[PDB]
Amino acid sequence: MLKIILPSLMLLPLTWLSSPKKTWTNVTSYSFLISLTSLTLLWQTDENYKNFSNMFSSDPLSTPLIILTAWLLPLMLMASQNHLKKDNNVLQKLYISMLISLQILLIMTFSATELIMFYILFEATLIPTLIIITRWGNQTERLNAGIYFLFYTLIGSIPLLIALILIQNHVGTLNLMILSFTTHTLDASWSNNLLWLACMMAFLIKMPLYGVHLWLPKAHVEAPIAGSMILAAILLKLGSYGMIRISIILDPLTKYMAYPFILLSLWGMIMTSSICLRQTDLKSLIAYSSVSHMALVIASIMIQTPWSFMGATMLMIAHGLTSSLLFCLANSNYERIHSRTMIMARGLQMVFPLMATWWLMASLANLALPPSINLMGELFITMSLFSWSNFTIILMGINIIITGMYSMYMIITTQRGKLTNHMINLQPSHTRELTLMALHMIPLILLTTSPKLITGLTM
Amino acid sequence: MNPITLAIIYFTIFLGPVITMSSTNLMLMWVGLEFSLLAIIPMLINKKNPRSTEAATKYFVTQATASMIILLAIVLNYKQLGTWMFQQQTNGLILNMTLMALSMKLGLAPFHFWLPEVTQGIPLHMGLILLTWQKIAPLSILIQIYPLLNSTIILMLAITSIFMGAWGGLNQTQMRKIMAYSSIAHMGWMLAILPYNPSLTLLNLMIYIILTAPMFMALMLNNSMTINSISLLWNKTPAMLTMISLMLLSLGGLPPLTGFLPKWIIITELMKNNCLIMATLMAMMALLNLFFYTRLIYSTSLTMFPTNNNSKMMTHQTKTKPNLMFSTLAIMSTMTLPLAPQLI
Amino acid sequence: MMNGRPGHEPLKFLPDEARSLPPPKLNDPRLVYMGLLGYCTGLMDNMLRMRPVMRAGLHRQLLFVTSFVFAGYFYLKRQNYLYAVKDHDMFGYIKLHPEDFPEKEKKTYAEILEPFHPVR
Amino acid sequence: DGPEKNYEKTLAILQIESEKAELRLKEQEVRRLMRARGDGPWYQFPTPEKEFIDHSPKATPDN
Amino acid sequence: PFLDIQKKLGISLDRHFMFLSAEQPYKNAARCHAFEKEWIECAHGIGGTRAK
């Protein structure tokens, strides 16, 4: 997998060497094709996964993501052509390159055989992200948000560093292939009960768990649209990908060491879903929607039943695409409105007829409408959770009712009701804004036709 | 300085560490340490400002008593073994003295009070020498005697330094002292692995030298001893803003940059030796060091502090360039990580 | 560590014994990296000194890309030796002190009985 | 090119990684042994050199 | 030692006088010269860990 990567690196030379006026089209057009080369990995045609070479591999779980990581770079660069079009021609070429490095790094992290290669690349992605959030962040508080995003991930990260070096000494190689075909069975000691927490905690932090998710609402609030898309679509899912590949070892402990997180997540799912119900900042509500719909995932990567896992793989890819779509349209309202407040800007369909159709489809993806991969995902996690304990439906049942309420409230108070009297007149929709959306949903429609590709390792 | 004097001094400041390293007769190692003490004091008071005399008089007393303690260890050994050099048989207290003494000259842990203060009153230039070409000498003496020193003490001085360095740095706003504090911290990691794998001490030093030397020549390019002063870097010289950003995050352990390797292999070696107690606590507060590094990042790069009109005047004039060493030592430092296996 | 080994060359860079090892291919990814590492140093310099970034010092750019690379071949040539000594040393010991590193028989899974924790 | 290429490539990747793993662990055991044993080329700490011991006939007769 | 510029250069400015059995002036043998020899020709080729 060096075509999904080397051609990517070369994007950096192109963003720099290219003309200031033509820099945007060379980069966006080329990474669209970079995504097309990424599609070749989908050609499995056999059970044996694809070990491209010693360090680089792609199995069913990584492949559905590498393609998404390559896909969003085009979109990210199309959603940030407006803001970041007021810059000095060298601030742009820095932002474009920063976005380019994220997927170079993220493509490799999702396509990495050695778990510590994951760690080095895993924690590197913070550098590009923190720059995108802090350097271009509009609000006074991004310095703070950046600190929260760096420390919560970093304090979790050093325990994983110690744990992975620890298993290398215990087993003798951090190669995901071998670690899988070798006998690593923890022994339920008090210490192992700590190892397990060391490995999972760093992944559980960037996958916002109810206890440590305050970093994500603060980060996406002041982050520029491209950073918020990256955090929701690819960055948070780095934590999920890690939990799937790391729990191959630590096989016995999670049977009983998971209860704490599972309950934290399911109760967390309800409270995070509910506070979405009365949050005035739209970007705030989407972020907590992201916490709740990701709290379902940590509760399926821990129950560990075949269906959970691919419920997880289905939902992660699906929610990634949906969340960005929501964060992208939130930005289009923010740029014309100039405020994140949900109460202002009422009645837009009256003035932006189509964006509202995109808003409606994004919300229906947000809630579980049935001919969507989003529902298949939740339906499956719901099933397994029920298997874990029939009572789980109650808590995963209060979340579904709340999820319907906030998803439609975003449509009802942003895209319906009487028009706002006279905010700065709202200029019509650009074709870029609409495509950036179409590019998010057309793939959501196509993937829903053949869900098999994003089903995970389990199935 | 009459250029002749400059030569004699500089030769001594350079013959000082070199005799230490080359000789085996400890005595000759002691005088190497003594010559470094004598040579550095003249340069320290070059401005001869009231702050400077204070600096040198502290540096000298701290250095002198430690030098006398190191000599006492050699004198005691001479009577416990006729040899003029530490051996397997050496009384444990004899070696511990040498650790404390040498940990004072290097300024590690509970003897970390002199360094921040002398780093504050000396010029940026002599600051570098006082931080990096004066650590080579004592460390050489320790690295030579590693097989014999105590694993317990070193670790305590190691951990303490890491903490003191980190905590001290958080509050400081003067750059010279932020660096002094960082050096205390890095010096700590170095002395942690000495008992186990000296060869890694020599990596955690070089990398520190290849990181700090560019960082200081950056601080002086604009001669800013204040963060507020380095924050207006964007107006005085915009290009160094990019690398100053990466070098400081490299000084802390963040993974893509070269700075991770020293911490990573030291942790790998300590876990190989089973200190998974000690290594863990060190790595954790090591993360505190990055917080103050990033706070500076914020002021200098990620956010643009307001500047002064008189600055437009300094822009007009051609900026005297930074030596080539900056580049070669900025890149070899910010990104060599892809070449770690051969470094270790 | 590896110092104190018999025959150690007290101050030599790469003892002739390292002749026996294969020479590093000049295009070894690493040496090529050092090259790029170098080009960047050059470009960076131009930038910090405020010169046209790429179109200036085309002589220097060469000195850099060619100094770093030169250094590489002769360094890697050594680091390669050091690693090679490590095996000579390591493998030898495994034998000279055989009992301590005994070959082990691993029972076919048929025989071994790892317990099965059910997920249910 | 086929199912054959990846299956055979993956087995080659596993053999390199399995052999690297066994050796890395054996290093740690050899390095534990030579440190304590001191019977191997690594961890051979120095003692004075007999090349300076003066074996000359000295003045007193018991040298 | 750390940098053996002495062995390399072949010079011996610091080794000739490190132990009591080294050449004493006018060949006035030291005291304990009967033993240090016996204790360093023993520990020669045997590293410290096994000179102890």
Binding site: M55, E114, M117, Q168, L174, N175 | - | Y83 | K20, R24 | -
Partner: peptide
């Protein structure tokens, strides 16, 4: 009796096995 000199590792160097075996470096 003098003690016995440590035994001597013997042979000729051969390129290291599988290369630097550092974390994930095919080398």
């Amino acid at each position: 009796a003098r003690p016995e000199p440590n035994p001597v590792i013997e042979g000729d160097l051969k390129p290291a096995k599988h290369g630097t075996r550092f974390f994930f470096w095919t080398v």
